């Protein structure tokens, strides 16, 4: 299953990974490329707001 | 210590306006809120809306609406309230209270939790 | 959109419990749990008597025992003396930013 949640930094719910934070980048030579960190372990986020 | 002043006691006519100035001294007045109740002798307490001493919003609650004005004065610490349009059966008492903490995060305003209170002010009419 | 409901006066002997209590709409009472008791003698401001349904305040003794169940917010006076003449008075969140205060009660020590 995979869920298709919108973000642009800081990767919301998903799959975890197996055993270790995972790097995963095209070439770590250039800057240009945008490098993927995958984490073992979540952390917990919530956002709230006042009324209309 | 903290305290909470008001006004002397008023006597008026029906069909005029009444301001009552609630002086807080001894902490920093703006982190609280400052509710306002009336009770006429004899029967129960009945609120006012609130007034936030940092930006200026106002509430205020049922059957005073286009009535009271509230306004703030941050130099001398003191907040006024203008009652407009009297009537015969608004002699009664008035107190200025404390409410919340000001938190940025949540609504705070409808906490009822008045610990200090004034000493109250009694306005009647004739 | 009327005052919260509350029995007319009480009375008793010193050294028992009083049970007091306020009903309403669950808009104002059953959906939040913000409700609070005053304490008013007659000639000068009232008293902060209980911040939540029952977390007390400073400067007051374990006395006095607030509860909440279903719509009615109860309170209940344990050890009367003679520094209780006065009057109790329900308040509570409303929706809105509103108040509502209580009716209010009247007490004699017998
Ligand atoms: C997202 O995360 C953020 C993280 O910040 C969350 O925001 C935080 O939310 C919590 C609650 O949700 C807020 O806590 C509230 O803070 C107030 C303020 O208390 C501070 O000031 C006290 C006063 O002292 C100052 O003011 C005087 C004024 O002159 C000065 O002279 C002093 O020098 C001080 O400047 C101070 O005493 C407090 O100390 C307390 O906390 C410290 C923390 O480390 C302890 O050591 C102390 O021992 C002491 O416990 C503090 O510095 C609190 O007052 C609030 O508690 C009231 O409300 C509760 C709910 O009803 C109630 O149960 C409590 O008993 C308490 O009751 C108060 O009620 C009336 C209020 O006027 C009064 O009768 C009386 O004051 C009484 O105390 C509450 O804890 C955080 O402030 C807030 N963070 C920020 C930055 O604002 C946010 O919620 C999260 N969002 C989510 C989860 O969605
Ligand atoms: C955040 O804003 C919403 C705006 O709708 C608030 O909801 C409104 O709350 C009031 C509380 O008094 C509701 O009024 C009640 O309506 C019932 C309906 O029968 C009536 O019987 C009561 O006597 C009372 O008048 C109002 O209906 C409700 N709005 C809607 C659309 O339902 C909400 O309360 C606000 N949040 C907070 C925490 O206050
Ligand atoms: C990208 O990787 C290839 C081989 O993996 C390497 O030859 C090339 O130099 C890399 N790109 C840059 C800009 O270094």
């Known amino acids: 299953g995979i869920r298709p949640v919108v973000s642009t930094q800081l990767l919301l719910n998903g799959s975890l990974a197996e055993k270790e934070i995972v790097i995963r980048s095209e070439n770590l030579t250039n800057n240009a490329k945008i490098i993927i960190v995958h984490l073992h372990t979540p952390v917990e986020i919530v956002c709230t707001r006042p009324n209309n | 210590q903290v305290q909470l002043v008001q006004s002397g006691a008023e006597v008026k006519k029906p069909g005029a306006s009444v301001k009552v100035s609630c002086k807080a001294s001894?902490?920093?007045?703006?982190?609280?809120?400052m509710h306002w109740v009336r009770q006429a002798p004899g029967q129960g307490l009945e609120w006012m809306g609130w007034?936030?001493?940092?930006?200026?919003?106002?509430n205020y609650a049922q059957k005073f609406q286009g009535r009271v004005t509230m306004t703030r004065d941050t130099s001398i610490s003191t907040a006024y309230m203008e009652l407009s349009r009297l009537r015969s059966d608004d002699t009664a008492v008035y107190y200025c209270?404390?409410?919340?903490?000001?938190?940025?995060?949540?609504?705070?305003?409808?906490?009822?939790?008045?610990?200090?209170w004034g000493q109250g002010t009694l306005v009647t009419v004739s | 959109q009327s005052a919260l409901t509350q029995p007319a006066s009480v009375s008793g002997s010193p050294g028992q419990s009083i049970t007091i209590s306020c009903t309403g709409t669950?808009?104002?009472?059953?959906?939040?749990?913000?409700v609070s008791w005053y304490q008013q003698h007659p000639g000068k401001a009232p008293k902060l008597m209980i911040y939540?349904?029952?977390k007390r305040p400073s400067g007051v003794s374990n006395r006095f025992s607030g509860s909440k169940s279903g719509n009615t917010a109860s309170l209940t006076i344990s050890g009367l003396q003679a520094e209780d003449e006065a009057d109790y008075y329900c308040?509570?969140?409303?929706?809105?930013?509103?108040?509502?205060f209580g009716g209010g009660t009247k007490l004699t020590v017998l």
């Open positions: 308040c509570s969140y409303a929706g809105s930013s509103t108040v509502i």
């Open positions: 209270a404390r409410g919340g903490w000001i938190g940025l995060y949540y609504d705070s305003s409808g906490y009822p939790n008045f610990d200090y």
């Open positions: 001894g902490y920093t007045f703006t982190g609280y809120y």
């Open positions: 007034i936030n001493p940092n930006s200026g919003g106002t």
């Open positions: 669950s808009s104002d009472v059953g959906s939040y749990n913000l």
């Open positions: 939540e349904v029952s």
